[PDB]
Amino acid sequence: DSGISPRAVWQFRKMIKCVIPGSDPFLEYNNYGCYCGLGGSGTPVDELDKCCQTHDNCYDQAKKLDSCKFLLDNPYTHTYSYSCSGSAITCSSKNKECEAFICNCDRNAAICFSKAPYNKAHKNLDTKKYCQS
């Protein structure tokens, strides 16, 4: 399997631009700390990492919904509709059950990330050293 995290799923890539400037900010939010990769272990290393853990937990909860089958197999399985004005992000009422749920996971993550300092030293942290459980 590709081992893709929620932060590589297609619509998250778009939504994160509501609050983080730049062309492809999603890349910054993959494989950072102990949790911004797929799953994770150990204690989150900073506030941004805590946001990732919660985002991961949110998608794990999503997996309990029957229409969330295949979620995280690749970036393209689920889409959804949202709008945003900075951190004012609205998940469209017309979203179906799984779509709505992951939109809300992404929204919560985007808002969390808008408040978390980006600590470059933690990008591709040595998880074998710092992320032991």
Which tokens go with 37?
């990769």
Query: What is the spatial distance between Cα 109 and Cα 111, in angstroms, rounded to a whole number?
Result: 5
Query: What is the spatial distance between Cα 114 and Cα 78, in angstroms, rounded to a whole number?
Result: 24
Instruction: Using the structure block, give the residue that is written with the tokens 């150990």.
Output: 42
Query: Of the residues 55, 60, 78, 122, which is catalytic?
Result: 55
Active site residue 55: yes
Specify the DSSP class assigned to residue 12. Answer: H
Active site residue 78: no
What's the angle, vertex CA 8, arms to CA 97 and CA 62, rounded to 5? 25
CB atoms within 10 A of CB 105: 23
53, 70 in Cβ contact below 8 A? no
Query: What is the spatial distance between Cα 116 and Cα 60, in angstroms, rounded to a whole number?
Result: 22
133, 44 in Cβ contact below 8 A? no
Q: Is 33 annotated as a binding residue?
A: no
Domains, the chain, ranges and CATH? 1-133 (1.20.90.10)
Q: Is 73 annotated as a binding residue?
A: no
Query: What is the spatial distance between Cα 56 and Cα 24, in angstroms, rounded to a whole number?
Result: 20
Experimental technique used?
X-ray
